[PDB]
Design an enzyme around this catalytic site. Structure first.
Site, PDB file in Angstrom:
ATOM      1  N   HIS A 194      -1.117   2.674   6.355  1.00 49.30           N
ATOM      2  CA  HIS A 194      -0.325   1.472   6.625  1.00 49.30           C
ATOM      3  C   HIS A 194      -0.966   0.177   6.076  1.00 49.30           C
ATOM      4  O   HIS A 194      -0.323  -0.872   6.128  1.00 49.30           O
ATOM      5  CB  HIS A 194       0.106   1.317   8.097  1.00 49.30           C
ATOM      6  CG  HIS A 194      -0.993   0.976   9.056  1.00 49.30           C
ATOM      7  ND1 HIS A 194      -1.528  -0.300   9.119  1.00 49.30           N
ATOM      8  CD2 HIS A 194      -1.578   1.747   9.998  1.00 49.30           C
ATOM      9  CE1 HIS A 194      -2.434  -0.259  10.086  1.00 49.30           C
ATOM     10  NE2 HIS A 194      -2.508   0.958  10.632  1.00 49.30           N
ATOM     11  N   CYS A 196      -7.894  -1.277  13.046  1.00 49.74           N
ATOM     12  CA  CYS A 196      -7.378  -0.088  12.360  1.00 49.74           C
ATOM     13  C   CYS A 196      -8.384   0.434  11.348  1.00 49.74           C
ATOM     14  O   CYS A 196      -9.074  -0.346  10.706  1.00 49.74           O
ATOM     15  CB  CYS A 196      -6.028  -0.368  11.706  1.00 49.74           C
ATOM     16  SG  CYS A 196      -4.726  -0.841  12.872  1.00 49.74           S
ATOM     17  N   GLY A 200      -6.976  -5.742  13.710  1.00 49.82           N
ATOM     18  CA  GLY A 200      -8.051  -5.615  12.735  1.00 49.82           C
ATOM     19  C   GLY A 200      -8.937  -4.398  12.945  1.00 49.82           C
ATOM     20  O   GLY A 200      -9.766  -4.078  12.089  1.00 49.82           O
TER      21      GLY A 200
HETATM   22  O1  LIG Z   1      -0.819  -1.522  16.064  1.00 48.72           O
HETATM   23  C1  LIG Z   1      -1.357  -2.127  15.134  1.00 48.72           C
HETATM   24  C2  LIG Z   1      -0.706  -2.259  13.770  1.00 48.72           C
HETATM   25  C3  LIG Z   1       0.420  -1.273  13.563  1.00 48.72           C
HETATM   26  C4  LIG Z   1       1.682  -1.501  14.086  1.00 48.72           C
HETATM   27  N1  LIG Z   1       2.698  -0.629  14.013  1.00 48.72           N
HETATM   28  C5  LIG Z   1       2.476   0.537  13.389  1.00 48.72           C
HETATM   29  C6  LIG Z   1       1.238   0.847  12.836  1.00 48.72           C
HETATM   30 CL1  LIG Z   1       0.935   2.417  12.142  1.00 48.72          CL
HETATM   31  C7  LIG Z   1       0.208  -0.067  12.907  1.00 48.72           C
HETATM   32  N2  LIG Z   1      -2.559  -2.726  15.229  1.00 48.72           N
HETATM   33  C8  LIG Z   1      -3.424  -2.756  16.336  1.00 48.72           C
HETATM   34  C9  LIG Z   1      -4.276  -1.705  16.670  1.00 48.72           C
HETATM   35  N3  LIG Z   1      -5.036  -1.655  17.770  1.00 48.72           N
HETATM   36  C10 LIG Z   1      -4.971  -2.682  18.608  1.00 48.72           C
HETATM   37  C11 LIG Z   1      -4.157  -3.824  18.410  1.00 48.72           C
HETATM   38  C12 LIG Z   1      -4.103  -4.908  19.321  1.00 48.72           C
HETATM   39  C13 LIG Z   1      -3.311  -5.992  19.067  1.00 48.72           C
HETATM   40  C14 LIG Z   1      -2.536  -6.048  17.911  1.00 48.72           C
HETATM   41  C15 LIG Z   1      -2.554  -5.018  17.012  1.00 48.72           C
HETATM   42  C16 LIG Z   1      -3.364  -3.871  17.231  1.00 48.72           C
END
Ligand SMILES: O=C(Cc1cncc(Cl)c1)Nc1cncc2ccccc12
Ligand SMILES: O=C(Cc1cncc(Cl)c1)Nc1cncc2ccccc12
Ligand SMILES: [Cl-]
Lengths: 300, 305
Positions: free
Chosen positions: A41, A145, A143
């Site tokens: 992603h 990921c 951040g």
């Molecule tokens: O979830 C996502 C991005 C994302 C969104 N939709 C799909 C995908 Cl595959 C990836 N990022 C995050 C990961 N971990 C904690 C996070 C806390 C706050 C904000 C963002 C966070």
């Protein structure tokens, strides 16, 4: 003596963390030999998050669109490919700090250490378990990921998880290092919900054995139970069914403490019925389920 | 989202762990520059341990009596000296992996990461706090002596603890890296007991702020309290007194969540007098006191090393 939630030393994984940038998105990558692994992603824009066609988005990319930074040194991407939900960026330099490693896919209930990273830099290490609903209860901000979950076997790092996303309930979903998601999750912003979580029964029993090894016996009772009667009781408290495999796995702890597995199962049934009544077990007022039978033996 | 007990990344410390052997005793040492630091009780026998004269025992030792192993390489000891309860073994090689470091003595309530080691090899890392009774509730087996506690500030490792012993209650006692024990403990096989412990009040409040940042608000109430009334209540539940310094340190969390420190104290007072009533805070049925205000800010803002 003592019983702590203990993570593996993170040094071998720290020397593998890099920052991967694609356009405006920056996340973490895992640099092993001449390959940087990261969530696919990273190639997504604002319009590509609900229904991304990753094959289509990736074909439009060139190697120079990926900026990889290892410390204060930019690495040169010389190839790119996708394996399920992970992006593999071939680089012109093998990581000199590459430890002995394996990619292992784990089962629910298994524990692992997480090296939480931001901008390719390690910020903390914690311990967690793969929940029965295939989510992990991590501690992650935007951040994070590409941050990875691992275990260590003597001098070998077994990479078992890569962080991809946070679900609406604040829990986390990700993949093994082959890009296969744990659980029915997809790397899309489409409405996704974790299933109702359950307690990892075999792990609670292992932790009750850890407490007995550490001198805590107040919860023991004179009762035993059949496996089926235990499971009928356990299911009513949203506890995972205990299988004959779990009973077998608890064998060494049962032999060490002299408390048969079904005897400890009757203690657990009683704890579920009564609660703790102002008492604690290993400094906890709740039954802990993020220590496997293997973790208990290793720590004790 | 999420709130975990999180330790600092241990890599900078792992490259410093070595095995120190003296006779039949094997424990861990910390190799920084050309000196290996370890508990001075490595020179003791089981009989010596009962009532030791460390100056007398050390004078009888030669450099070749200390076997130091860094990985699969034996280091040669070229000098030895004692500083309080820590033995300093001068080696002929400076550790190429020596990070930027300082030796710091911490106060009760401060947290730090422990890299538990056996035979000079790191086996686990965990976060803990120096209890108000100066013990740590660690997880250590025989062979863990010499394991160290540390914090990281930017790229600098501040070494704050070295493991020396386990008390009869299963809790642990040790020294700073200058060999000064934390607490009224001595390095001798003798009757020693940790004092009655107390709860680290400033840390509980910091963890209540972390819960609010994570969406847990059930425990909040409309009330506030004076610092004196809170301390009168806190003293009754074996909670450490909350000072004006603690109130000031909680300032940023108070500003971020909109809950004044004395407002959060009134939530804590009610939690103490009434309990949780079947509810949990951050997945815990007990008030957690092993996260400092700095730990909460670091975790809820993602600071890196
Ligand atoms: O979830 C996502 C991005 C994302 C969104 N939709 C799909 C995908 Cl595959 C990836 N990022 C995050 C990961 N971990 C904690 C996070 C806390 C706050 C904000 C963002 C966070
Ligand atoms: O306590 C000692 C040795 C010792 C004894 N008297 C005085 C001194 Cl300075 C040192 N070792 C240990 C440390 N940590 C956890 C241990 C778990 C089991 C067994 C031994 C452990
Ligand atoms: Cl602060």
């Amino acid at each position: 003596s003592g019983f702590r939630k203990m993570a593996f030393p993170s040094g071998k994984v720290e020397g593998c963390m890099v920052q991967v940038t694609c356009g405006t998105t920056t996340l973490n990558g895992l640099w092993l030999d001449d390959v940087v692994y990261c969530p696919r992603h990273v190639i997504c824009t604002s319009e590509d998050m609900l229904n991304p066609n990753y094959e289509d988005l990736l074909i439009r990319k060139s190697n120079h669109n990926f900026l990889v930074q290892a410390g204060n040194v930019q690495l040169r991407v010389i190839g790119h490919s996708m394996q399920n939900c992970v992006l593999k960026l071939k680089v012109d330099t093998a990581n000199p700090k590459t430890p002995k490693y394996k990619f292992v896919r784990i089962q629910p209930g298994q524990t692992f250490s997480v090296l939480a990273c931001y901008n390719g830099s390690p910020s903390g290490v914690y311990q967690c378990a793969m929940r029965p609903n295939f989510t992990i209860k991590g501690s992650f901000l935007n951040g994070s990921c590409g941050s990875v979950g691992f275990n260590i076997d003597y001098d070998c790092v077994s990479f078992c998880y890569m962080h991809h996303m946070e679900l609406p309930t604040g829990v986390h979903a990700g993949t093994d290092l082959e890009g296969n998601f744990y659980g029915p999750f997809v790397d899309r912003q489409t409405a996704q919900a974790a299933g109702t979580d359950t307690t990892i029964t075999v792990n609670v029993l292992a932790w009750l054995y850890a407490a007995v090894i550490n001198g805590d016996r107040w919860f023991l009772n004179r009762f035993t139970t059949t496996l089926n009667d235990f499971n009928l009781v356990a299911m009513k408290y949203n506890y995972e069914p205990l299988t004959q495999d779990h009973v077998d796995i608890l064998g060494p702890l049962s032999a060490q403490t002299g408390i048969a597995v079904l005897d400890m199962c009757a203690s657990l049934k009683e704890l579920l019925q009564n609660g703790m009544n102002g008492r604690t077990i290993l400094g906890s007022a709740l039954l802990e389920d993020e220590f496997t039978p293997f973790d208990v033996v290793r720590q004790c």
